[PDB]
């Protein structure tokens, strides 16, 4: 399948060169897989989700996404127009409030919830968790992310937006999960993106168009936008039977576009998420 005039990020992950506008993908499109978006929630009613989205857990008075951040990331995972895996099932877990904030104990609870909840769901092709959040280093936050990954969920997490070494941030610094840096449309590391040896892979993160609350759309920037690209790609590749949850991150690095990115500090991987699609 081909999506013409696609968002730049989608075109990029189906190409070996920047500057193209068509997203090429297999028509299976993540069907039979599930992605939990652990964030501010998801506006499940947005027409772009086609009824494939649902809220399963909230830690606040409402399950409603009153921010937009969660809806944006879920959109990049698997909305019709802006999504990598256009037929995946989306599950919303609201651990962040409508200001984009949450405490560590809640985020940990949300991760443990997903580890258990996936056992109640029909996800024959596998389970992915997308974590577009983080803060200062915490061993117990890192531990919860390791547990979720261990439980058989492919965990992808934002490197963070501090133009610093991601080793001082959590869950980004947990070696066992898939830590995602951001790139822009000219194959440069995003100016805000964290880096370092703990990074596994880069994804499109600058100027990413996706779903927003109120049934709208907008373009925003962040390693938060890069993460759902990788999480969506994992779901896609698991549906195609090319990899499993335990090995998806490694498989994504092995088959990545290598050496194409600029402004990568020495000691950071030069690897860009790539679907390796051939009609």
């Amino acid at each position: 399948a081909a999506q013409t005039n696609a968002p730049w990020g989608l075109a990029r992950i189906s190409s070996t060169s920047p500057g193209t506008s068509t997203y090429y993908y297999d028509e299976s499109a993540g069907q039979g897989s599930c992605v939990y978006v652990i964030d501010t929630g998801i506006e499940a009613s947005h027409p772009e989700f086609e009824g494939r989205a649902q809220m399963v857990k909230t830690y606040y008075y409402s399950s409603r996404d009153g921010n937009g951040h969660g809806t944006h990331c879920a959109g990049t995972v698997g909305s019709r127009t802006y999504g990598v895996a256009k037929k995946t099932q989306l599950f919303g877990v609201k651990v962040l409030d409508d200001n984009g904030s949450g405490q560590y104990s809640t985020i940990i609870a949300g991760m443990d919830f997903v580890a258990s909840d996936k056992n109640n769901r029909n996800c024959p092709k596998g389970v992915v968790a997308s974590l577009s959040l983080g803060g200062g280093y915490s061993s117990s936050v890192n531990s919860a992310a390791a547990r979720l990954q261990s439980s058989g969920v492919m965990v992808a997490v934002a490197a963070g937006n501090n133009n610093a070494d991601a080793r001082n941030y959590s869950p980004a610094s947990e070696p066992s999960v898939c830590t995602v840096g951001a790139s822009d449309r000219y194959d440069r590391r995003s100016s805000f993106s964290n880096y370092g040896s703990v990074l596994d892979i880069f994804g499109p993160g600058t100027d990413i168009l996706s779903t927003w609350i109120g049934g709208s759309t907008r373009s925003i920037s962040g390693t938060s936008m890069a993460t759902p690209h990788v999480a969506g790609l994992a779901a896609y590749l698991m549906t195609l039977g090319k990899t499993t949850a335990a090995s998806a991150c490694r498989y994504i690095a092995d088959t990545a576009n290598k050496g194409d990115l600029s402004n990568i500090p020495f000691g950071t991987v030069n690897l860009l998420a790539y679907n390796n699609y051939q009609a």
Binding site: G100, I107, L133, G136, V141, G160, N161, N162, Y169, S170
Partner: peptide, 8 residues
């Protein structure tokens, strides 16, 4: 935990 909320 303490990263993004609105800040550009």
């Amino acid at each position: 935990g303490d990263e993004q909320g609105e800040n550009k």
